[PDB]
Amino acid sequence: TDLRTWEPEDVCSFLENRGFREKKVLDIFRDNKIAGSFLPFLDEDRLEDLGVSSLEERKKMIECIQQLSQSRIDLMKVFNDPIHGHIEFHPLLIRIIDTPQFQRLRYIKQLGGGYYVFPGASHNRFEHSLGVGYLAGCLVRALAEKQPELQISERDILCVQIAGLCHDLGHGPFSHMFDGRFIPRARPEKKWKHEQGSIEMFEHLVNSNELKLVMKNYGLVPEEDITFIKEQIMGPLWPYKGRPATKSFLYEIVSNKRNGIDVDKWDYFARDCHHLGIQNNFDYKRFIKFARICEVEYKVYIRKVKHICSREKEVGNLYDMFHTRNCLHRRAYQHKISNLIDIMITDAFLKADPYVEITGTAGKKFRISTAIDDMEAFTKLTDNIFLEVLHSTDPQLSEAQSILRNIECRNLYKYLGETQPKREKIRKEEYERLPQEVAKAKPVELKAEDFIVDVINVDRVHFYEQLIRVYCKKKDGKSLDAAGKHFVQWCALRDFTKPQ
Ligand SMILES: Nc1nc2c(ncn2[C@H]2C[C@H](O)[C@@H](COP(=O)(O)OP(=O)(O)OP(=O)(O)O)O2)c(=O)[nH]1
Ligand SMILES: [Mg+2]
């Protein structure tokens, strides 16, 4: 048979009939519910920690496990990715992957409104998350072997991979629109980051599916390692609790907001380049091979830390990466129409928010805007909500539908143009005023609602602006002229660049 089929007692019988007949050791296996599937992932040290103090018995135990048909490599699962080719995942990762909480990422478009501008961009967070997991695994492995002095363990590697998988667990419908346009607009009081949702949903994931025990049986320590995983996704003497300062570099792998060089970016750069039809000058495989940990000292008392570093002559590689970063940002991410569509979807959601019910834990009803407060509600919240509204028979959503029908018939707000501030910038508070200002600025009645102003912010490593787009909702010719010249005058008044 397979070990996969084996209950814990089956493993106990196997162990007995293979010579280990001492009830204490069998009790170990019954107690931790070590079903067969775990066996090929057991260590001498794991057997030590579980509590067999027979320095030779552990060896013979593992020998028995080695003799078996099915090995470690025989219980990996191989995904076929067009970005990364084939991809092996350790079974725990699969257990995490195969949950409602995670599978939900199949139904959230990576580029959100993007798909409605770039028909190639049909890809969702699911496959990108897989990719990030895999890449995380690659870099941590490479550093582990090249420098075994680092004491990087299997455990660490799995935690890094899991952090990888789950960095985007907490995105809402249409990805960045939800956490960047809708929630801030619907819950201005609340500060919310998709990462917050990510760690909350991971906590939910492991608990709804009782993977806490499973993690233990694969050699993780849930209490420590879950905090490690969470910390990697979220962020912050030594602030982190998940790992000692001696293992600091691990935190630079999955999310590195400092210098913007991490495996999340690598995957979605490559992937988005793949689907948009853009050629990506950056070979990450070259990066990982020439990646080494080495110590850095900055004097503030001098501080000494272990950062991830790359050979100095692989600086051209980074020039290639940052071009691609800019290339994507310029052409695709801050695309004037994509963002228009995100704005319209948000606008619809806002008008649908009051009436759409989404049940969470104990069946408490939540609104689209508040589902983020209950993971068991948020688990149900996906892009599909777009179509649910659009197709609803509830007549309270007529307002919301009509906006979505306009998206369908390509009847979008008309784009008056872009502008730049010559100096200074616009206070995050000052935003709500802007549609008023444009409306009120005279060169026809034009309400402040008839305008949207879209403010956009354009935005180290170690070796060994503001854009304003104005859209007008009213789509008739005369109002369009009036609005255009309103915008021009508003630009002139604030001493802004001559519109596009
Ligand atoms: N488990 C899983 N596999 C997926 C998913 N998406 C694509 N795949 C691919 C990867 C697998 O290599 C392929 C087959 O996996 P399955 O567990 O469904 O069946 P398989 O034929 O590998 O039998 P096995 O479980 O290895 O005995 O499906 C997913 O969300 N979950
Ligand atoms: Mg990502």
Numbering used by the authors: 72 to 307, 316 to 379, 385 to 527, 533 to 548, 559 to 563, 589 to 624
Which text from the study accompanies this structure?
The sterile alpha-motif (SAM) and histidine-aspartate (HD) domain-containing protein 1 (SAMHD1) is a dNTP phosphohydrolase that restricts viral replication by limiting the cellular dNTP pool. The active tetramer form of SAMHD1 is induced by cellular nucleotides, which bind two allosteric sites of each subunit. The SAM domain is not required for dNTP hydrolysis and viral restriction by hSAMHD1, but is essential for these activities of mSAMHD1. To better understand the regulatory role of the SAM domain, we crystallized full-length mSAMHD1 in three different states (0, 1, and 2 allosteric nucleotides bound).
In addition to the 2-Allo structure, we also captured crystal structures of full-length mSAMHD1 in two more activation intermediate states: no allosteric nucleotides bound (No-Allo) and one allosteric nucleotide bound to Allo-site 1 only (1-Allo). The 1-Allo crystal was crystallized with dGTP-α-S in the crystallization mixture and diffracted to 3.4 Å resolution. The No-Allo and 1-Allo mSAMHD1 structures also crystallized as tetramers in different space groups (C2 and P21212) with 4 or 2 copies of mSAMHD1 in the asymmetric unit, respectively. However, this symmetry is broken in the 1-Allo tetramer, which is a dimer of dimers, with only one overall twofold axis. Our No-Allo and 1-Allo structures show that these inactive tetramer intermediates are composed of two relatively rigid dimers with loose tetramer interfaces. Although mSAMHD1 is capable of forming tetramers without nucleotides bound to Allo-site 2, these states are inactive and likely represent activation intermediates of the enzyme. Nucleotide binding to Allo-site 1 causes the dimer components to swing around a pivot point and close in toward each other. Starting from the most open No-Allo state, dimer A′ swings progressively toward dimer A via the 1-Allo-state to close the tetramer interface in the 2-Allo state. Since our experiment did not include GTP or dGTP, which are the only allosteric activators to bind Allo-site 115–17, we conclude that some populations of mSAMHD1 protein were purified with GTP or dGTP bound to the allosteric site 1, consistent with the previous observations. These tetramers likely represent activation intermediates similar to our 1-Allo structure, and they are not fully active states of the enzyme.
